Amino acid sequence: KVFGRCELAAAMKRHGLDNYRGYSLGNWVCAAKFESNFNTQATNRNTDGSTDYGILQINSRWWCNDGRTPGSRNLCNIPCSALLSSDITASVNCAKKIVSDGNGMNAWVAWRNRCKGTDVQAWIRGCRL
């Protein structure tokens, strides 16, 4: 599923991400835009052999099991394929665990390099919640 901007902002707000660990909704929408272009089906291989999955590009090195990342963890206790669903519940619940692990949204390279210290409120401008 390719979300619209405000459709994704509403889905993230309904799943409890607005000001989750102090990160405003626009931070989450900006992260999703630059990680996946709002596409739940996005996958990308990392240099180490792990793979990133879904709208927030969650990595199999630590967070999910994809059956092909040897010596990795599954800290979200999910198959990586759950992160590709049109339903973002699994991605949101795993993102809450990641953002709580010590580095906050710095876990998302795209967020640090493209969203952090920008006017992220722009990403929810015009949206009905």
Binding-site residues, please?
Answer: 101
Contact partner at residue 85 from Cl ion, Na ion, none, CB < 5 to 8 Å by partner kind:
none
Sheet with 43-45, strands from edge to edge, namely 43-45, 51-53, 58-59
Bind-site residues for substrate? 101
> Per the structure block, which two tokens stand in for 82?
């759950």
Q: Tell me whether residue 40 or residue 72 sits nearer to Na ion (CB atom).
A: 72
Query: Which single residue brings its beta carbon nearest to Cl ion?
Result: 104
Question: Which residues are known catalytic residues?
Answer: 35, 52
Q: Tell me whether residue 79 or residue 104 sits nearer to Cl ion (CB atom).
A: 104
Q: For binding to Na ion (CB under 5 A), which residues are involved?
A: 60, 65, 69, 72, 74
> Rounded CA gap, 64 and 62, in Å?
6
> Rounded CA gap, 5 and 91, in Å?
17
